[PDB]
Design a protein around this nucleic acid. Structure first.
Lengths: 141, 151, 262
RNA sequence: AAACUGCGAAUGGCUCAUUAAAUCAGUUAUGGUUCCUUUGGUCGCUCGUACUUGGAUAACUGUGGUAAUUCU
RNA sequence: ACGGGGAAUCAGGGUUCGAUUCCGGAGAGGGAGCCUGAGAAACGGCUACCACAUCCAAGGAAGGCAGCAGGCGCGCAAAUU
RNA sequence: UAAAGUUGCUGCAGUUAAAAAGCUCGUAGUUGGAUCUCUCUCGGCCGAAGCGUUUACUUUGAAAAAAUUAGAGUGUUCAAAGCAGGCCGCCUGGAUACCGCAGCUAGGAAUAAUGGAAUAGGACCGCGGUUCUAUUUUGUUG
RNA sequence: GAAGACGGUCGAACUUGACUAUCUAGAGGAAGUAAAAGUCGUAACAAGGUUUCCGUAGGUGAACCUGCGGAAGGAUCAUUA
């Protein structure tokens, strides 16, 4: 059982401090290895240069070729695989051009079918993918 | 005893001991009145301070120390320094989240005037705040209360 | 910081000035003078915010530089001159005299006094000391030094100063049973008879005071200003006689006054 | 106008790199210190050319140097 | 990691945040040393070194926007010379 | 941040879902059984009348920037706001509460700690006892 | 009363030999994870065809096998003077 004494505040506080490190979320947030290992470096978005276009096979229950791009982040130079969400949107991206990439929605975790992909392309050539998909804007020549 | 143990002469700066007195008018020693003051706040000057021969400029009673500020208490923990002791102040600090307390302590170095002869380890001392007397010392022992088990 | 500060932010100004928050970034930093920065009312606040004789600081300066404003019988042209407790402000052009006197809310009231009352002021003696080959000296809260005071005058007493000559004409001792105002703390601006003084050597003496309505409070001795011998003040008091109504009685009085009109 | 003299330029504004009982906050102390200014006091309290003393230097005039300066 | 007043959230309890207009501290590219002054180890003061950098007739001279605008760079990220 | 009683003080779990050390001793830490209902100034209504071992606790009282928060008043045209305003020169605001912890203060005395004499070095007190106060009651050490 | 010199002091910095972190157009080992939709077997789940598992030690192209001691989470809560 736990200590119930008027002068056990030190023991209770120290035990909570120690046992908080056994929480995955707390340790990830407060240890610093996750921020060092995070390609964005704690940022919500990041810019990169599209190194190439790749096709990732969906995980076994599903069958599809998810169109991603290998990009290299400008801020630090890391190589990232970023999903290109909608259909035909891979036709908007051209190799060796600027691209704004966000997280995939699960805070550094792969989403759905696409394995090992935790980033998605948000903008290409400083115009959003949603504007290109709907025809609101066009690629700058 | 041997008051003059330092390289410089030891004397109370306010007492003139070189007054001219004829030999035949001697009653006891020629002339050495002892300077002492009564510190405030109801504290009693120790008898050893009034009838002593020690020279201590940091003494609250016969020295050049004015007591003002906080009056604290502690238990004597160490007496391994010259005219200085280390006392321990124990207290309970409240942690609000757990609605509880924890034992904390602070060690305080206080000047011990030689007027308090026979001061042991573990007895209570009432100290008063003064000007900085050294790097770490800012309190002077004003009262000594013996420990409960001391016969 | 290096050296002294010269500005006062409007929000760091004393709250009893009743300055608003949108007029500017700065409040008029009181000049050095007889009264402390937080226990004074600058001349600009008095002539602009309280009396509405001026709309801006430029108009306050225009009034002051015509030498129309006297403080304690002397013309002052400094618009941030610190006027404090008991100080007499005379505007001879409009023929009006005021005495800076605290409200029961702790604010300096616009308290108009007769020209006969404007001839003198009460001063709480801050210290008594002997200097200059045995000459006794007295220092008041107003920071004026008086040589050769009465031998009976002690610290915490109240003297009466004739502003024309600036010498003591009367004095009240600090005794139990004497009327007093409170010049600081939670009870600032309250007037009552001193009941008892509990002494704490090496610390702050506490003085207990009883209102004219029977309410008892307590302050530090440094916040007590003896006003009159017995229960009779030696100065005029504001419309509220130092009796601090609770919020319920204030509400009731306001409602009664409102319902009496129309 | 200029220039000499006096005063301010140590305030304000910016930023958060440093900094882990350090800063800071509340609480006290300076009887262990300094304090321009403001305000009040003191300022024939000293037993020993005056109906006003001396030499400069700016500004100004004039001569200049350097590629170049709020140089001189 | 500037501290605090405080902010977000919150049944009770808490959790996180506080560079940011108020108060206190610190700094003025990095260190160091001073002059004047009541007050500065001041940088819209000086002296030197370190880094960067401006003009030059090559002898020398002059620097300090974490002030207000504004520019470059950085970046996901922030306005008028 | 809540949801997360998935960090649990309130308030979680540990047989088999993750989990009690192989087992004992043991210092610090934490927690510990009953018990105890004048006032050495006294003057013919007033004051030199005492934290009276102490602390923790509790209830006060001081003292504690403003802004923010809560909150009183106030038809910004409503509201976020603001600290204004209102009445035919006059009248009225610019409140108040809260402000952990530590420090100061004063009542209570349950609860909790602590103390009082057992080698009597014990409480009250009549009787004594070996240095020594610089005020002596009015022509000054005559 | 200037330049200047000596000696101190504060002391930036310089030369010199010694002690952290990351990008790699490089090597070089044994590892882990995912896709194994391929081979070699069959270790485990039924007494899984040698009951399984734990500690330890040794040996195997591999799951594994064997010795010693333990457990039932056993395939026996039981076996009779």
């Amino acid at each position: 059982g736990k200590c119930r004494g008027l002068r056990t505040a030190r023991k209770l506080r120290s035990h909570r401090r120690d046992q908080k490190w056994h929480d995955k979320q707390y340790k990830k947030a407060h240890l610093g290895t996750a921020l060092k290992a995070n390609p964005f470096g704690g940022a919500s978005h990041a810019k990169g240069i599209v190194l190439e276009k790749v096709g990732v096979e969906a995980k076994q229950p599903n069958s599809a070729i998810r169109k991603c791009v290998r990009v290299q982040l400008i801020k630090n130079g890391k190589k990232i695989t970023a999903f290109v969400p909608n259909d035909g949107c891979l036709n908007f991206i051209e190799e060796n051009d600027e691209v704004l990439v966000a997280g995939f929605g699960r805070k550094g975790h792969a989403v759905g079918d696409i394995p090992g992909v935790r980033f998605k392309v948000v903008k290409v050539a400083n115009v959003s993918l949603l504007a290109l998909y709907k025809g609101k804007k066009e690629r700058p020549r | 005893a041997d008051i003059q143990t330092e390289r410089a002469y030891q004397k109370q700066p306010t007492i003139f001991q070189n007054k001219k007195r004829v030999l035949l008018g001697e009653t006891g020693k020629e002339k050495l009145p002892r300077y002492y003051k009564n510190i405030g706040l109801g504290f009693k000057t120790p008898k050893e301070a009034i009838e002593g021969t020690y020279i201590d400029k940091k003494c609250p009673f016969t020295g050049n120390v004015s007591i003002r500020g906080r009056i604290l208490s502690g238990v004597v923990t160490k007496m391994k320094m010259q005219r200085t002791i280390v006392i321990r102040r124990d207290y309970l600090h409240y942690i609000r989240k757990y609605n509880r307390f924890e034992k904390r302590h602070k060690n305080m170095s206080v000047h011990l005037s030689p007027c308090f002869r026979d001061v042991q380890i573990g007895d209570i001392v009432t100290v008063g705040e003064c000007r900085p007397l050294s790097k770490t010392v800012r309190f002077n022992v004003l009262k000594v209360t013996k420990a409960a088990g001391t016969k | 910081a290096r050296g002294p500060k010269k500005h006062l932010k409007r929000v760091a100004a004393p709250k009893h000035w009743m300055l608003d928050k949108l007029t500017g970034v700065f409040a008029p930093r009181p000049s050095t003078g007889p009264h402390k920065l937080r226990e004074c009312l600058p001349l600009i606040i008095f002539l602009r915010n309280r009396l509405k004789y001026a709309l801006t600081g430029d108009e306050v300066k225009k009034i002051c530089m015509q030498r129309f404003i006297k403080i304690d019988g002397k013309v002052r042209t400094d618009i941030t001159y610190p006027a404090g407790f008991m100080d007499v402000i005379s505007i001879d052009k409009t023929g009006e005299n005021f005495r800076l006197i605290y409200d029961t809310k702790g604010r300096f009231a616009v308290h108009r006094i007769t020209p006969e009352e404007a001839k003198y002021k009460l001063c709480k003696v801050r210290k008594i000391f002997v200097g200059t080959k045995g000459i006794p000296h007295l220092v008041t809260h107003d920071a004026r030094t008086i040589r050769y005071p009465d031998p009976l005058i002690k610290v915490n007493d109240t003297i009466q100063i004739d502003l024309e000559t600036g010498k003591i004409t009367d004095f009240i001792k600090f005794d139990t049973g004497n009327l007093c105002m409170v010049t600081g703390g939670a009870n600032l601006g309250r007037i009552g008879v001193i009941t008892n003084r509990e002494r704490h050597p090496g610390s702050f003496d506490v003085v207990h005071v009883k209102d004219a309505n029977g309410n008892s409070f307590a302050t530090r001795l440094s916040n007590i200003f003896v006003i009159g011998k017995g229960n009779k003040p030696w100065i005029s008091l504001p419309r509220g006689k130092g009796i601090r109504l609770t919020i319920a009685e204030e509400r009731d009085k306001r409602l009664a006054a409102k319902q009496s009109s129309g």
